[PDB]
């Protein structure tokens, strides 16, 4: 039983990271091509060490060290996939017939979620049968998302060369940050105070924040700030393909490695599974070698 949850979590993490290879036609991080090559090289070293840790600790029944090696492999495999997916995008967009497009100022999905979370927290802290503890827990949700919104505003301000947009992203973030401080002040103010006037008073302090959040959502929704997707030409997709296939093969074999290790950890008396394990481990290594060679040969 012990060790199996680590393996199950790793297999779930692999299933998630594999979506990055389905249509890698947009950037997924800020890594340069050499950033990608550096990350692939470092993770190759880490994974090599982890694959040896997985086999040796399953063999010897060191189940805490086995679990750490499974977790370490998983993290290195996810890093590899992120680097491979970014590298593929950069290869595709570098083709002469590709159109690179532009980065949007604010990632829209997490932006909308942050605004909704603040709005829902403000509504929750205002519900009539809500306990004082729920007021405080709602405040922590507001603080979390207020910090994320401010960071994203500072980034958006950095990304734009338009002085008016530069200034407005900061001012809008400032309005959100100061309204949260006033709301937190009023929550902190509540001490042994659980009366209808303070319930109404907390509700009252949500208004400037909800308005500031709405004003920022309206400002940030200007189509001028939106991403314009890259267009990858057929030849760019052909150029990316060896990187994508090698990364997909690494993950397929890594998944088999982890499934095999999960069984061997419980029962290491299994000569067939030991060969399968060595086969998956060598195919993982072969795929990484092919991916690095492909990243160098197909380099823009």
């Amino acid at each position: 039983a012990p060790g199996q949850k680590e393996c199950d979590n790793a297999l779930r993490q692999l299933e998630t990271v594999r979506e990055l290879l389905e249509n890698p036609v947009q950037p997924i991080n800020d890594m340069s091509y050499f950033g990608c090559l550096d990350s692939v090289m470092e993770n190759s070293k880490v994974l090599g060490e982890a694959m040896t840790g997985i086999s040796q600790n399953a063999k010897n029944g060191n189940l805490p060290e086995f679990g750490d090696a499974i977790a370490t492999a998983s993290k290195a495999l996810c890093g590899f996939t992120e680097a491979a997916a970014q590298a593929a995008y950069l290869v595709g967009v570098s083709d002469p017939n590709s159109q690179a497009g532009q980065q949007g100022l604010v990632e829209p999905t997490q932006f909308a979620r942050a605004n909704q979370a603040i709005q829902m927290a403000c509504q929750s802290l205002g519900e009539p049968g809500c306990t004082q503890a729920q007021v405080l827990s709602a405040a922590t949700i507001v603080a979390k998302h207020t910090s994320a919104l401010c960071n994203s505003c500072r980034l958006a301000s950095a990304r734009t060369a338009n002085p008016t947009a530069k200034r407005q992203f900061v001012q809008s973030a400032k309005e959100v940050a100061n309204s949260t401080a006033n709301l937190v002040k009023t929550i902190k103010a509540l001490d042994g105070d659980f009366t209808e006037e303070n319930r109404a008073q907390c509700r009252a302090a949500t208004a400037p924040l909800l308005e500031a959040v709405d004003n920022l959502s309206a400002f940030a929704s200007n189509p001028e700030f939106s991403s314009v997707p890259a267009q990858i030409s057929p030849e760019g997709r052909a150029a990316m393909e060896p990187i994508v296939i090698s990364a997909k093969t690494m993950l397929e074999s890594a998944g088999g490695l982890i499934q095999t290790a999960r069984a061997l950890a419980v029962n290491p008396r299994d000569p067939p599974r030991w060969s399968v394990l060595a086969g998956h481990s060598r195919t993982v290594s072969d795929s990484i070698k092919k991916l690095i060679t492909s990243m160098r040969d197909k380099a823009p």
Binding site: T140, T146, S147, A148, C150, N151, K174, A177, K188
Partner: peptide
């Protein structure tokens, strides 16, 4: 602590207030 907690949550908020 009630102040330490909200400080941990508010992240790098000061970079905006000072700005």
């Amino acid at each position: 602590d009630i102040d330490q907690m909200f400080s941990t949550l508010l992240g790098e908020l000061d970079l905006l207030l000072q700005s």
